[PDB]
C-alpha cells in the first residue's frame, strides 16, 4: 500500500440521489460545437481525414489565425428549444456539452478570456440558452471542459523550468476561475467531464486535479466529476497508485467498450462511455464518406451493451456552423428515439444482471429485479439460451411489447431455452423474464 494525499476519495459507488440519477439516466447525447465547425475538416483547399475538431493541429494553424474564425461565428439557425426537442425525441436523459474544447473558444461569455461567444457576431450566451432549453425539457446538462487550451500562452505541455512552473501556475488559476464561473453561472449543472488532461504538466500537478474536484463539489451539491480529470501524487491517471478509481465514475471507454466476458470488473464502479457516429469525428466534418458511418442498430447495440455492464452511453453529435444538425444526425436521433420509446424499459434505470453473456444479445436488470433479454442476433435454432446463476430460476417469459407469454423450457440444471416469439419482431427486441432467487442463495435478487 502507497500513501497518497491526492488519490481516491469515494470508497465504492456513490449512492446519493444525485449519483443515482446520473446512473439511472443511462443514455446521453454529446455535443461538440466550436469554431472547428466552420471549416468542417477543410483548411485552405485541403480536406483533412483526421478529427475535425483537431483541424487546427492537422493543418498546423497558428492560434491567432485559428481564433479569427470567431469573426465568422454566426449560427443563424441555432435554436436551443429545437435542439432540446431533438434530444427529447431521441430519448436522451442528459446532454454533455463542449463548454470549451482544446481550441479554447468558450460557448459562454467568460470574463477570463476574450475568446468567447460574446466577441463574435452572434454575441449570445449559447451555453446558457442550451442549459435553459434542455432543463425545460427535463434533460440534465453536463459540461465538457478541456483543460488543455491552445488559445492561452500560459499553457504548458510539460514543466521543465521554474518559468514553466510560474506560467502553468497562472494557467491553473485561470482554469479554476473558468470552472468556478461555470459552476456559479449555471448551478443546475450535474457533471463536469474533463478532457485534455493527459499532458505531463497535468500529471505533475495531481494536487490540482484533486482540488478542482473538491472545489466543484463544494460549489455544486451532488455534482459528478469524471475520472479523466484526476492524477494522483505519482502522476497516475483515472485510477490512483493503489488501483482505486478517482472521481465519481470511469470515463476512459471512448469509441470502444469493455468486453462482456472478460471485463466484468467494470460492474464494480460507475462508468460512462462515449461514441461517434462515424469512425472518428466529434466536431462537424463536411465529408462523412471518408470513414465508416454507423447504422442506428449498430448504435443501439452499443447503448445496450453499455447498460448491460453497468455503464452509461453518450452518443455524439457535431452540429453545423449554422446551428442546425446535418441530415444523418437527425435520422439517427429519430431512429434511436423510436426504438427507445418501444424498448426503453430495458435501458433506463437498468444495470448489470449478473448472468453469463450469451450470443443472442444482452441482459439488463430493472429496479424491481426484472431481467430483460435484449435480442440482437436471432438464432436459427429458435431458442434463446439462458443460463442462470446459482439459486436463480426463471418463472416466466413475456414479450415486452405485447405481453404475450413465451415458452420457457428447462434443458439442464441452471439452463433454459427461452423460445423466440412466434412472429419475428424484425428488429432488436426485448423478452422480459421473471426470476426467483431461492431461500438461502447468494448474489443480489
Ligand atoms: C471526447 C473526445 N476527446 C478528444 C481527443 C482526445 N485525443 C487525444 C489525442 C492524443 C492523446 C490522447 C488523447 N484526441 N482527441 C476528442 O476531440 C473529443 O473531445
Q: Going by CA atoms, what residue is nearest to atom 8 of ligand 1?
A: 196
Please choose from 198, 275, 285 the residue to mutate so as to test ligand 1's pocket, defined by most ligand atoms within 8 A of CB: 198
Q: Going by CA atoms, what residue is nearest to atom 9 of ligand 1?
A: 196
Alpha carbons 392 and 427: distance in angstroms, whole number: 29
Rounded to the nearest angstrom, the distance between the alpha carbon of 198 and the centre of ligand 1 is 10
Q: SS3 of 381, please? A: coil
Other residues' Cβ atoms within 10 Å of the Cβ of residue 43: 16
Count of helix runs (H) and strand runs (E) in the chain: 10, 16
Give the three cell numbers for residue 69.
474564425
Q: Going by CA atoms, what residue is nearest to atom 11 of ligand 1?
A: 198
Other residues' Cβ atoms within 10 Å of the Cβ of residue 289: 7
Q: SS3 of 101, please? A: coil
Alpha carbons 204 and 415: distance in angstroms, whole number: 52
The resolution in Å comes to 2.0
Looking at the DSSP bridge assignments, the partners of residue 405 are: 398
Alpha carbons 125 and 108: distance in angstroms, whole number: 5
Structure letter (DSSP) for residue 389? P
Alpha carbons 307 and 156: distance in angstroms, whole number: 38
CB burial class (10 A; 0-12, 13-18, 19+) of residue 410? exposed
C-alpha count within 13 angstroms, C-beta hemisphere, residue 263:
15
Dihedral-angle region of residue 160 (phi above 0 means left; psi in -120 to 50 means alpha; beta otherwise)? alpha
155 near 102, Cβ under 8 Å? Answer: no
**Residue tagged 488532461 (cell numbers):** 197
Q: Domain spanning 1-348+438-445 has what CATH number?
A: 3.20.20.80
The size of the chain, in residues, is 445
Distances (CA, A) of 279 to 42, 275, 297: 18, 9, 15
195 CA: nearest ligand 1 atom: 3
**Residue tagged 443515482 (cell numbers):** 20
51 near 98, Cβ under 8 Å? Answer: no
Q: SS3 of 407, please? A: coil
283 CA: nearest ligand 1 atom: 17
223 near 18, Cβ under 8 Å? Answer: yes
Give the three cell numbers for residue 143.
459540461
Residue (of 378, 431, 437, 380) closest to 408 by Cα position: 431
Give the three cell numbers for residue 291.
470513414
Give the three cell numbers for residue 36.
472547428
Looking at the DSSP bridge assignments, the partners of residue 415 are: 387, 412
* Backbone angles phi and psi of 397, in degrees to 5: -130, 140
Residue (of 318, 348, 280) closest to 144 by Cα position: 318
Alpha carbons 353 and 309: distance in angstroms, whole number: 8
Give the three cell numbers for residue 393.
430460476
Give the three cell numbers for residue 376.
440482437
C-alpha count within 13 angstroms, C-beta hemisphere, residue 38:
18
Give the three cell numbers for residue 316.
455524439
32 CA: nearest ligand 1 atom: 19
For 434, the enclosing helix (H) or strand (E) is strand 429-437
Residue (of 274, 288, 280) closest to 326 by Cα position: 288
Other residues' Cβ atoms within 10 Å of the Cβ of residue 380: 6
**Residue tagged 470549451 (cell numbers):** 100
**Residue tagged 473558468 (cell numbers):** 178
Q: What sign has the CA pseudo-torsion 210, 212, 213, 218?
A: positive
Rounded to the nearest angstrom, the distance between the alpha carbon of 29 and the centre of ligand 1 is 17
Q: SS3 of 414, please? A: coil
Q: Which residues contact ligand 1 via a Cβ below 6 A?
A: 51, 53-54, 195, 198, 254, 274, 282
Looking at the DSSP bridge assignments, the partners of residue 364 are: 372
Give the three cell numbers for residue 44.
485552405
Rounded to the nearest angstrom, the distance between the alpha carbon of 233 and the centre of ligand 1 is 24
CB-based contacts of 215: which residues, under 8 Å, 6+ apart? 176, 179, 180
Distances (CA, A) of 416 to 250, 370, 379, 392, 435: 35, 17, 14, 12, 12
101 CA: nearest ligand 1 atom: 19
β-sheet with 371-375: strand ranges across: 361-365, 371-375, 429-437, 392-399
Structural class in CATH, domain 349-437: mainly beta
Structure letter (DSSP) for residue 90? H
Other residues' Cβ atoms within 10 Å of the Cβ of residue 160: 11
Alpha carbons 87 and 165: distance in angstroms, whole number: 43
Please choose from 277, 282, 315, 317 the residue to mutate so as to test ligand 1's pocket, defined by most ligand atoms within 8 A of CB: 282
Domain positions in the chain are 1-348+438-445, 349-437
Dihedral-angle region of residue 361 (phi above 0 means left; psi in -120 to 50 means alpha; beta otherwise)? left
Rounded to the nearest angstrom, the distance between the alpha carbon of 372 and the centre of ligand 1 is 34
Q: How was this structure determined?
A: X-ray
Same fold, 1-348+438-445 and 349-437: no
Task: Tell me how far apart the terminal alpha carbons of the chain are, to the nearest angstrom.
Answer: 34
Looking at the DSSP bridge assignments, the partners of residue 271 are: 250
Rounded to the nearest angstrom, the distance between the alpha carbon of 227 and the centre of ligand 1 is 15
Residue (of 42, 74, 64) closest to 55 by Cα position: 42
Q: Going by CA atoms, what residue is nearest to atom 18 of ligand 1?
A: 282
Give the three cell numbers for residue 171.
494557467
Rounded to the nearest angstrom, the distance between the alpha carbon of 366 and the centre of ligand 1 is 34
Alpha helix segments (H runs only) across 188-258: 200-203, 206-219
CB burial class (10 A; 0-12, 13-18, 19+) of residue 139? buried
Other residues' Cβ atoms within 10 Å of the Cβ of residue 121: 11
Amino acid at each position: 500500500e502507497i500513501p497518497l494525499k491526492y488519490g481516491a476519495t469515494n470508497e465504492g459507488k456513490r449512492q446519493d440521489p444525485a449519483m443515482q440519477k446520473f446512473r439511472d439516466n443511462r443514455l446521453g447525447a454529446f455535443i461538440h460545437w466550436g469554431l472547428y465547425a466552420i471549416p468542417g475538416g477543410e483548411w485552405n483547399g485541403k480536406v483533412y481525414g483526421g478529427a475535425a475538431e483537431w483541424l487546427k493541429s492537422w493543418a498546423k494553424v497558428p492560434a491567432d489565425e485559428w481564433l479569427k474564425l470567431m469573426d465568422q461565428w454566426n449560427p443563424t439557425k441555432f435554436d436551443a428549444k429545437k435542439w432540446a426537442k431533438m434530444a427529447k425525441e431521441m430519448g436522451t436523459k442528459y446532454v454533455k456539452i463542449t463548454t470549451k474544447h482544446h481550441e479554447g473558444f468558450c460557448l459562454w461569455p467568460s470574463k477570463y478570456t476574450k475568446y468567447t461567444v460574446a466577441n463574435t457576431p452572434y454575441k449570445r450566451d449559447i451555453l446558457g440558452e442550451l442549459v435553459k432549453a434542455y432543463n425545460d425539457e427535463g434533460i440534465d446538462v453536463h459540461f465538457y471542459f478541456s483543460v488543455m487550451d491552445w488559445s492561452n500562452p500560459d499553457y504548458r505541455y510539460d514543466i521543465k523550468s521554474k518559468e514553466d512552473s510560474i506560467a502553468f501556475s497562472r494557467f491553473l488559476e485561470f482554469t479554476d476561475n473558468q470552472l468556478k464561473e461555470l459552476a456559479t453561472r449555471y448551478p443546475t449543472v450535474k457533471d463536469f467531464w474533463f478532457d485534455g488532461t493527459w499532458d505531463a504538466s497535468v500529471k505533475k500537478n495531481g494536487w490540482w486535479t484533486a482540488h478542482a474536484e473538491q472545489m466543484l463539489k463544494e460549489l455544486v451539491p451532488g455534482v459528478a466529476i469524471n475520472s479523466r480529470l484526476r492524477a494522483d501524487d505519482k502522476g497516475k491517471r483515472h485510477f490512483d497508485s493503489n488501483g482505486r478509481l478517482m472521481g465519481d465514475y470511469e470515463s476512459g471507454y471512448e469509441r470502444r467498450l469493455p468486453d462482456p466476458v472478460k471485463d466484468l470488473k467494470v460492474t464494480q464502479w460507475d462508468w460512462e462511455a462515449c461514441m461517434t457516429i462515424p469512425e472518428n469525428q466529434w466536431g462537424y466534418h463536411k465529408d462523412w464518406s471518408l470513414s465508416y458511418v454507423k447504422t442506428p442498430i449498430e448504435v443501439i447495440d452499443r447503448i445496450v451493451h453499455a447498460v448491460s455492464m453497468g455503464g452509461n452511453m453518450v452518443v455524439n453529435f457535431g452540429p453545423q456552423a449554422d446551428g442546425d444538425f446535418r441530415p444523418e444526425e437527425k435520422a439517427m436521433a429519430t431512429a434511436i428515439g423510436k426504438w427507445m420509446n418501444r424498448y426503453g424499459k430495458a435501458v433506463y434505470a437498468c444495470d448489470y444482471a449478473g448472468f453469463e453473456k450469451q450470443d443472442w444479445g444482452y441482459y439488463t436488470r430493472g429496479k424491481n429485479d426484472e431481467v430483460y433479454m435484449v435480442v440482437f442476433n436471432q438464432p436459427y435454432s429458435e431458442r434463446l439460451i439462458v443460463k442462470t446463476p446459482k439459486g436463480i430460476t426463471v418463472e416466466k417469459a413475456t414479450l415486452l411489447t405485447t405481453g404475450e407469454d413465451i415458452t420457457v423450457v428447462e434443458t439442464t440444471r441452471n439452463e433454459y431455452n427461452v423460445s423466440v416469439p412466434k412472429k419475428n419482431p424484425g428488429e432488436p427486441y426485448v423478452i422480459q423474464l421473471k426470476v426467483r432467487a431461492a431461500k438461502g442463495t447468494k448474489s443480489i435478487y
